[PDB]
Design an enzyme around this catalytic site. Structure first.
Site, PDB file in Angstrom:
ATOM      1  N   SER A  62      51.487 -66.763 -48.502  1.00  0.00           N
ATOM      2  CA  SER A  62      52.438 -67.383 -49.408  1.00  0.00           C
ATOM      3  C   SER A  62      52.259 -66.769 -50.779  1.00  0.00           C
ATOM      4  O   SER A  62      52.814 -67.279 -51.756  1.00  0.00           O
ATOM      5  CB  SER A  62      52.272 -68.906 -49.446  1.00  0.00           C
ATOM      6  OG  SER A  62      51.010 -69.286 -49.954  1.00  0.00           O
ATOM      7  N   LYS A  82      55.114 -77.355 -53.730  1.00  0.00           N
ATOM      8  CA  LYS A  82      54.849 -76.235 -54.622  1.00  0.00           C
ATOM      9  C   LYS A  82      55.489 -76.439 -55.987  1.00  0.00           C
ATOM     10  O   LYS A  82      54.847 -76.197 -57.015  1.00  0.00           O
ATOM     11  CB  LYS A  82      55.341 -74.940 -53.994  1.00  0.00           C
ATOM     12  CG  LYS A  82      54.558 -74.519 -52.774  1.00  0.00           C
ATOM     13  CD  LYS A  82      55.053 -73.182 -52.266  1.00  0.00           C
ATOM     14  CE  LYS A  82      54.311 -72.761 -51.015  1.00  0.00           C
ATOM     15  NZ  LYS A  82      52.878 -72.465 -51.290  1.00  0.00           N
TER      16      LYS A  82
END
Lengths: 532, 532, 532
Positions: free
Chosen positions: C436, C479
Site C-alpha cells: 500500500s 486511511k
C-alpha cells in the site's frame, strides 16, 4: 495413583533387560509423585511408555523350506519364474548362516524395478511363506538423524525413531520390514541418517542399535530386512555393497492380460459384491491395457478394473437384468471415460526437429522427445530443461562429429559461428552415470540444421563418443521393453550390444526390428526422410 | 449422596462391555470415601459421568436403497448432475457388501473443493437419506493428540478427544461424522495429528480405537466417516491412500441464479421475518451475482441476500404501507451501496503488455494478469514474483520462437543483445503448477516487444515448445469454471483438447466461445488487436 | 436463634423452581442446630445466601420500537451515522422475529474499535431505549473456566462464576449484559474459556447453564448479550462466526471538538463540584486535542479536561473571586504543565530522500516515513527494517518504471548498473506490510535518485504495477481518518478509488483535499518541486 500403579507394575509386568531395568527403576525413582501437573512427569510418562512398550527379545517361528516357499512364490502376480530362482538362491544363502548367525558381508536383497510390479507382493509372499509378519516404512524425504535415530531426551515432544516406532508396532523382533525408496534419503538438516541405516544394516551393529530418544541402544538383531528402491546408483555408495541386485523387469501386454484374467479382476469383482454377474471378454482387457494406461506396473490397471466393477454395482442396483453380462471392447467407454491413448501413435506424421528417444528413468523405461530449435545469430549452444553437464558434453561430442561432415548431409559451410542452438530434453541426467542419448541429440541437431524431417516411430538410443564412435550402453532390456509397450517397431543400436540381445524373450523381438549400426552417418542414413 | 446412588444405577443399567463394567465398578469401589473430595472424588465422579453418558449400545436405523437417496438428493441445493452419480456409486458399492462380507476395506469419500459449494449440506442430505444423526467435527488447526485423543485422566482437567464429545452429543453410535478441513491440520506444536487420523481412517484398527481419558478402547466400528478437504496437495501421504476422491468445483452463473431462486432467497426471507412482503426479480439476482461478489460458491451470495432482507425489515418497520415490495435491478444499490465490482469484461481497454491466463487456486479459480516489461538495456532476462525455473523455461521457449520469427511480428532483426526483459507474474504460487501459461507469456512478450496491444476480454491457456507448437493442458473443467466465473466470454484452448471438450456437462459450454488453436501464430493473429 | 425460621420462610417465600426446590430441600437437610462456627454449615448458610438472591422470573417491560431507539441514540456522541444505522437494522430484525422463535440462533454484535470511542455508551443508550438494566462484565485476559463457570464448594473459595455475580447485581432476568474485550481472553490454563462463552452464546444450552457451585444449572433465556473487541482476527474461529461486524473507527477533529463542547466538558465541570465559573472557547479545546494526546477515541480529552476542572476548583479554593475565568489555548499550559507534543507535523522540511505514507495501527492511525540512500556501487538493492518481499518487489517495479523513462527525469541514462540503493523502512512491524506504499516508494526512489525535493505536507497511498499504473487500495475511510488525525491537508489517491469517495461523510472531504491520480506520471509531476 493407579496410573502410577500401572506404570510401576509395567516395570515387572514386562520382564526387562538389565540396563533397561536399571534406567526403568531410575524412572520410578523420579516417580512416586503426581502423574501429571509438572511437565517433568509427562516427559517421564512418554519416556516410560516408549521404553516399556517396544518388545524385548521375542520372535516368530521360522521355516527352512523351499518347497512351500516355491508354492507361495508361484502365485504373486502370475509368477515371474526367473527372479524366483534368484530369491531361492538368496534363501539358500540363509542355508549357510551357521557360525556367526547373521551372514552379512553378504547380500541384503535390494529389489529394483518400476513402482508396484509385485515388489511389495514379493515381500508379502515371503511373509506368508515364512509365517512371519510384515510392515512398511517409506524413506521418502528423509534427511534427519532424529527420524531414523533418536531425538534429544530433554524435551516433551521429542521424537523416537521411525524404526523404533515401527518396531514398537510389531510385537516381535523378526518382522519383515520393507524399506521402501531407500534411494531418496538425503542430508540437509541434522546429519545424514544413511550412516544410521548403515548401523542398522551391518552384521554386528544392529544388536546394539544406538538411539537418543531411547537412552540405551536397542537390540535389532533378528529382523528380516527387505529393501526396495527405484534407482540403482543414488543409493548410499558404501551401503551399495553387501547387496544382491534382484532385477525385476517390467512386464509385457500378454502377461498383464494373464494377470488381469487370473489375479486382478477376480479381486476387483469380489471387492464390489458382483460375484457371478459381470464378465469381461479378453479383447476388452487388451483395450484397457492398450488405450487406458501407459506404464510398466499393474497399479493403474487395477484402478481401471475397479472403476468397471463399481459401475457394475450401480447398474445392477438399478434393476436386475441378467445372470451374466458381457462387456466387449465396444462399450468400455460407456463404463470408463474417454480413450486416453491411441493404440497407433504412428499417426504422428513425422516432425522436423524432434527426435524420439528411449530412456532409463527411476520408474523404469520411457520415451522422450528431444526438441531442438535452430535460430539465427552468431553461433552458440544452450541446453535447458534441468539437464546435467553429462548431456551437455554428449551434445558437445555430437557437434564435434557434425563439424567435420558439412556438405555430405545438407548443412552449410559452417554452423559453429552463425547459428544459435537451443536444446530442450524433457528430463535431465540418467541415474546410471552416463548420457544414454548421444545419437538421439545427434539426429535431432542434424535434422534441425539440415531442416530435414526426422521420422518418428523410430525409437533410438546410443552414444556419440569424442571420436564420434557409437558406444555400448547398459540396461538395454528396459528401454527395449519401453519401446515394446508403446508399440514402437524400429530401434537403432550400437552393434556391440547384440550380446545384450541374448537376454531378450521372443515376443519382444517379434516387433523390434533392430538396425545394429556403428557410426553416426549410418543413423543419419537410416532415419531421415532424405536418404542422407 | 443419593446422586451417587444414581451414578451407580446409571452405570449398572446400561448394558456395557464387561471391561467397562470392571473399571467402572472399581471406580465405585475406590469412591464413596473422599466425601469432602479434593479432586479424587471429583475426577472419578466425572469419569463415571463420562462412562454413563457416552453412547454404549445405542441403535439407529439405516437405508438399504440407492433409490430413496436419489429421491432425497434432488432436494438440497441442486441436483449437480455429476457428483450425484459418484455419491451413488460409492453407496452402491457400500450396499452390495453390507452385511459385513470380508471386503470391508473401503475408501472414505474425501470431498475436495472450494469453501462453501455444498459440502456439509451434502453430508446433511445423505444423513437424511439414511436416517442417521448428522454431526460435524472441525479440524482446522489441529496439532497435538490432546485434541484427537485424551490427555489427562489423573486430575479433572484435560478432556478426552474431539471424538468422544462428538459421540456423546449424538445419542446413537452411528452418526455421519463430517471431519472438515483435513489438510489445514498439521504438526504445528510438538505432537502428531496425522497418525491418529490414519488410525481413525482404517477399519481394522478402529474396532478398538482408544483414548486416554477412558481406559477401554471405544467401539467406533459403525460410524460412516466422511472427510472434506480444500486442497489435495498438502494432505499427508499415508492419508492420501485409502481416500475416495470426489471433486466438487464451483458453479456457473445460471446455476447460481437457479440456486438463489430455489433455496437461498426464500430461506433468507424466512430469516428476517419479512415473508410475502419483499419481492426480487431475476435481474436483481443476476445483478447481485455478477456485480457484487467473485468467489466460487455461494457464501457471499448468502451474505448479500441477508443484507437485502434486513434492510427490508428496517424499511418496513419504520412504516407499514404496502402489500408487497418489488425490487429489480434499478434499486439494488439503495439496499446495498456502491458496487464492489464492475460489469462485463467487454469494455476493458486493450493494454500493450498484459495477458490474462486462467488458474485454479484452491480457494476458487482466477484470472492472472501477467505483465512483462521490455527495458532498453543489455539483453539478459529477469523474473519476479514467486517463480522457479518452470516459468523461466516457458519464457525462454516463447522468446526462442520469437527469435526465430522476428520478421513475422515486426520485431527488429536482433534483440537477444539489445533489450532486457522483466517479467512479473502476479500470483507465482498457483499450486496447481506447471507451464500452463505458455501462450500467456508468449502473448505478453510479443506484445511488449512489438508495441501492439494484447486484447483483454479473451482468456487463453496452453503450453509451448521450442518448435512453436501448443501442447495440451490437463484440467479443462476447472479452467473453464474460472473463465466462466470471472466474466470472460472468449477462450482459446489448444486443439488437442477438443476431445476433452465434449466431456463437460453442457451448462459450462453455454456462454463460452472457444477458438481452438494449435500454433502460436494463430493466437498472435487473434489477440494482437491491430495488424502487426 | 430463629435464623433457620426466617431462612425457611424466605426460601418458601422466594419463588423457586421445583427441582431447585428439591435441591433446596437437600440443602435444608443438614440444618437444625443452634451453634456457630460450623465449617460444614457455614458453607450451607452462605450457599443459601447466594440462593435467596439469584433472580427467578423478574421482568422489565421491554419496548420494541425502532423509532424510540433512534430517538435515544441521538443522545450518544456527536453522530456516528453508520453504526447507528447498523444497530437499527439489527434491532429491526429482532423486532420482527421476536416471539416467532421458529427462527432463532441470532448473532451477538461484535463492536470493533480502538479503545476510547463510545462502546459502552452505545450499550447504555440501547439499554435506555429498551428500558432494560445494563451491567458490564469484563472478560479480557481470563484463562480459566472455573472463573466463568462455577467453582467447587469443597475447598474454601466457594464462589459462583462471574456471570452469577453479574446476575446477582441485576435484579431481573432480562438485562443487557456486555462482554468487553472478548479477544483478550487467553487460553493457556486448565479450562479453555472459549468453549464456556460458546455455551453462554448458545441459545439452547443457556437454559441449563452449568455452575460448579449452584447445583441445578441456570437459565439465560432472555439475556441480550453484546460483545466488543479490538481486532476480529484474534477471536477463535467458531466464536468468530455468529458475530456481526459493526466496525467503529476513530474521529476527526471537528467531531472531537463537538464531543467536548456538547457532552464531555459539562460533565467534567459539574462532576468537579464547580459550575458556571469557567469559560473555554474553541481555541483551548483545539489545543488540548491536537497538541496534548495521540489517541483515536476520547479518553484523553476526558482525563485532561477533568484534571483542568479539578485544578480550577483548587484555584477556586484560594478565593471565590469571579464567576468567569475565561480559558483559551494561550494560558492552558498553566494548568497542564509542559506540553508534550509538537505543534507542527505539517511543516516537515520538504527534503529529498523522504516519503510520507498513510497507514494505521489497531490503536489508531499513523504516518510511515520511508528513507532511500542512493550510494555508488555495483547496482543492487538493500532493505532493512522489517522489509520482506512485497516491499522490495514494489521497489523493483518502481525502478523498472524509471528505467523506461530516463529522458525526462534527469537520471543517468544507465543507472541500474551503477547505483546501489539502501531502502530503509523504520516501521514494517506496524501492520499491513503488504503493498500500500507503492507510489510512496516511487516518490522516495525518484527523489533519492534525482536529488530533487520530495514534498512534505502531501500524503499518498496506493500500489504500482509494472507497466506503470496505480491500482486501487481498500479501506479508504481508515486511511483518510489517519490523514485527518495526523495533520495533513493534501492526499494522493488512485483514480479507481473515486467511487468509494462518495461513501464517506461529507465532513471528511472538506477539511481534506484529495488529489486523484491514475499513473505514476501525475504523481511525479505533483511531488517534485523542481522536476529536472
Amino acid at each position: 495413583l493407579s496410573d502410577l500403579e500401572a506404570l510401576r507394575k509395567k516395570i515387572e509386568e514386562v520382564g526387562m533387560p538389565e540396563a533397561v531395568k536399571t534406567k526403568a527403576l531410575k524412572e520410578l525413582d523420579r516417580l512416586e509423585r503426581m502423574q501429571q501437573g509438572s511437565p517433568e512427569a509427562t516427559v517421564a510418562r512418554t519416556y516410560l511408555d516408549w521404553l516399556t512398550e517396544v518388545p524385548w527379545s521375542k520372535a516368530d517361528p521360522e521355516v527352512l523350506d523351499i518347497n512351500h516357499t516355491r508354492q507361495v512364490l508361484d502365485e504373486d502376480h502370475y509368477g515371474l519364474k526367473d527372479v524366483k530362482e534368484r530369491i531361492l538362491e538368496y534363501l539358500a544363502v540363509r542355508q549357510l548362516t551357521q557360525g556367526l548367525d547373521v551372514r552379512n558381508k553378504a547380500p541384503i536383497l535390494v529389489l529394483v524395478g518400476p513402482p508396484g510390479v509385485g515388489k511389495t507382493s514379493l515381500g508379502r509372499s515371503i511373509a506368508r511363506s515364512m509365517n512371519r509378519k510384515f510392515h512398511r516404512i517409506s524413506l521418502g524425504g528423509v534427511r534427519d538423524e532424529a527420524e531414523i535415530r533418536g531425538h534429544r531426551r530433554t524435551y516433551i515432544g521429542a521424537m523416537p525413531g521411525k524404526l523404533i516406532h515401527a518396531m514398537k508396532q510389531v510385537g516381535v523382533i523378526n518382522p519383515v520390514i520393507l524399506l521402501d525408496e531407500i534411494d531418496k534419503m538425503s542430508s540437509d538438516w541434522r546429519g545424514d541418517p544413511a550412516s544410521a541405516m548403515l548401523e542398522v544394516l551391518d552384521p554386528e551393529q544392529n544388536n546394539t542399535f544406538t538411539d537418543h530418544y531411547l537412552d540405551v541402544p536397542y537390540d535389532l538383531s533378528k529382523v528380516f530386512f527387505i529393501t526396495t528402491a527405484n534407482t540403482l546408483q543414488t543409493i548410499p555408495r558404501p551401503l551399495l555393497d553387501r547387496m544382491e541386485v534382484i532385477e525385476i523387469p517390467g512386464y509385457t501386454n500378454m502377461e498383464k492380460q494373464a494377470i488381469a484374467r487370473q489375479y486382478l479382476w477376480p479381486k476387483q469383482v469380489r471387492e464390489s459384491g458382483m460375484e457371478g454377474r459381470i464378465e469381461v471378454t479378453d479383447a476388452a482387457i487388451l483395450r484397457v491395457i492398450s488405450e487406458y494406461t501407459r506404464e510398466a506396473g499393474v497399479r493403474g490397471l487395477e484402478r481401471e478394473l475397479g472403476k468397471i466393477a463399481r459401475k457394475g454395482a450401480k447398474f445392477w442396483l438399478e434393476g436386475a437384468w441378467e445372470g451374466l453380462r458381457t462387456i466387449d471392447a465396444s462399450d468400455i467407454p460407456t463404463y470408463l471415460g474417454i480413450p486416453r491413448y491411441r493404440p497407433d501413435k504412428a499417426e504422428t506424421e513425422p516432425q522436423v526437429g524432434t527426435a524420439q528417444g528411449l530412456a532409463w528413468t527411476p520408474v523404469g523405461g520411457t520415451l522422450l522427445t528431444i526438441e531442438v530449435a535452430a535460430v539465427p545469430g552468431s553461433g552458440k549452444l544452450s541446453l535447458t530443461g534441468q539437464l546435467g553437464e553429462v548431456m551437455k558434453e554428449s551434445a558437445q561430442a555430437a557437434l564435434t562429429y557434425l563439424r567435420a561432415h558439412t556438405q555430405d548431409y545438407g548443412l552449410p559451410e559452417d554452423f559453429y559461428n552463425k547459428v544459435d542452438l537451443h536444446v530442450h530434453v524433457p528430463d535431465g541426467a540418467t541415474p546410471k552415470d552416463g548420457p544414454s542419448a548421444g545419437i538421439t541429440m545427434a539426429t535431432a541437431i542434424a535434422s534441425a540444421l539440415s531442416r530435414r524431417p526426422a521420422r518418428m516411430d523410430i525409437a533410438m538410443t546410443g552414444e556419440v563418443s569424442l571420436r564420434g564412435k557409437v558406444m555400448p550402453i547398459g540396461g538395454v532390456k528396459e528401454k527395449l521393453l519401453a519401446a515394446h509397450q508403446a508399440g514402437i517397431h524400429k530401434i537403432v543400436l550400437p552393434k556391440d550390444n547384440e550380446a545384450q540381445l541374448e537376454e531378450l524373450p521372443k515376443e519382444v523381438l517379434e516387433g523390434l526390428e533392430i538396425k545394429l549400426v556403428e557410426d553416426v552417418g549410418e543413423v543419419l542414413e537410416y532415419l531421415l526422410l532424405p536418404e542422407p
